[PDB]
Design a protein around this ligand. Sequence first.
Ligand SMILES: O=c1c2c3nc(n2Cc2ccc(Cl)cc2)Oc2ccc(F)c(c2)OCCCCCCn3c(=O)n1CCCO
Ligand SMILES: O=c1c2c3nc(n2Cc2ccc(Cl)cc2)Oc2ccc(F)c(c2)OCCCCCCn3c(=O)n1CCCO
Ligand SMILES: [Ca+2]
Lengths: 325, 162
Amino acid sequence: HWVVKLLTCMTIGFLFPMLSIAYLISPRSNLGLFIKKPFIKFICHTASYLTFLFMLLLASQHIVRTDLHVQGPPPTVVEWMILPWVLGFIWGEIKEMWDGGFTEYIHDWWNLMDFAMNSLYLATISLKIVAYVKYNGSRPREEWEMWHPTLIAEALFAISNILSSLRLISLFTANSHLGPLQISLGRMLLDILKFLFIYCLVLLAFANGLNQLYFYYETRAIDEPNNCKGIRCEKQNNAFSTLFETLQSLFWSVFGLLNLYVTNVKARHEFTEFVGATMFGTYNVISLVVLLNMLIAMMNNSYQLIADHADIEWKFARTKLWMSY
Amino acid sequence: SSLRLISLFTANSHLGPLQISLGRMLLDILKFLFIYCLVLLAFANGLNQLYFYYETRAIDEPNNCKGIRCEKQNNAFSTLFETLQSLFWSVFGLLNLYVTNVKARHEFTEFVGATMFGTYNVISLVVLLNMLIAMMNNSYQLIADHADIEWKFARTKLWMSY
Ligand SMILES: O=c1c2c3nc(n2Cc2ccc(Cl)cc2)Oc2ccc(F)c(c2)OCCCCCCn3c(=O)n1CCCO
Ligand SMILES: O=c1c2c3nc(n2Cc2ccc(Cl)cc2)Oc2ccc(F)c(c2)OCCCCCCn3c(=O)n1CCCO
Ligand SMILES: [Ca+2]
């Protein structure tokens, strides 16, 4: 169970390029016709993906590169060899839509994660060539603008890797131990919706009074130490001034990362600070003691009804998988 | 050498059936450990790829201290070895919030950094720890029965060695 059948599969994995080119040159030989088997196709398709996912860790941490002061540099050798993968993925996505129903295509929920990836990969080429053609020269990095093309053309490339690495969860249905765990996790995500609705109402209700009470004492940045304004500084300040900051403030205090001296106002007024502190203290009891003690009690009940018939719904899925090769 | 006094609990009637019930709980953390490991190496990459342009040195910092564990934390998302220790310690609450603020005045990067840091907490502290409880609760109520047939077997196997 653990040695020979574990080694044969690793052995076949390495042979995928030569098998591909052999099928390409002659499809009726004895080396050809050996890839038209439902298991070998699976192994080859699975092995052709870890190579792509491993040629991306080299671009994250530079193995060898040049200094970073030019506006638009030419692409390096690692980036020259990634285009074929993207082009092949787009061509395959377009081809799958042809010999299949359009309504039949849109009924799968994974296609919704293969559209966003493709869009975020397609924007970067244009955003990079624009800066390669327009700009020229070199200047230090501490004087660039906030909306420079070279700065916007890296955030999308950083975001895309996360959505491209979380797709190894659709392979758990081919195993007997990790199989029935995805089916039990699929049910838990139908319990957070209603509590999310109630929490959203309870949060926009409170996000209004606190903003209405504190919008008289808004200072500026130059009059503050170290020219820092808002939370995320070393000394937090101006936390209930606008409506966009009052919504980020209330979110971060669920985990415990908000201090208590942010309710103290200048100008000596004492009657306002007490009402502010009471409004801040009433919001914690409703959210941390009454609501999180109900998710547990409901998810406990929901789990004990899906434990049964958990093998009739995994075999259906893995049968639907096999029938595609 | 001091944690080996737990193999003597099988010779007593009160502490005996407790080790047998603890032995079953350790077969539930494995799969959640697998899923958590995948969810953590997925996120440990983007944050490292976004912040590796602003790595300073030690001599230009106060008191010649670089990294977390100083009095004023700094350089938390520079390399891949620090990004993996940073994400671990934040589960308990020992990481501050001013570590996502970069120099050089750029404002559009800090927002994306803060959003990436904030999305990782909801998936780990609200959706996963609320499932270990609900599954360990079910696993315990099936081993409570026949808990005296498996303790006497063990203590019989003990006696037969002397
Ligand atoms: O300190 C409190 C507080 C409190 N409810 C309390 N306490 C403690 C307390 C007790 C007595 C006194 Cl003479 C002063 C403070 O205690 C109780 C006492 C009886 C209760 F039944 C109860 C809470 O729960 C009711 C719902 C919780 C509302 C929190 C408001 N609430 C509150 O917003 N603050 C913040 C005020 C900022 O200064
Ligand atoms: O502050 C948040 C935040 C948030 N989801 C939120 N909020 C609070 C919020 C509400 C409204 C506005 Cl206009 C701005 C912030 O609230 C919601 C609102 C509806 C939801 F359905 C929900 C969360 O849960 C979705 C999954 C959680 C993703 C966290 C992202 N997420 C997040 O990464 N940050 C960090 C940003 C750093 O500045
Ligand atoms: Ca697809």
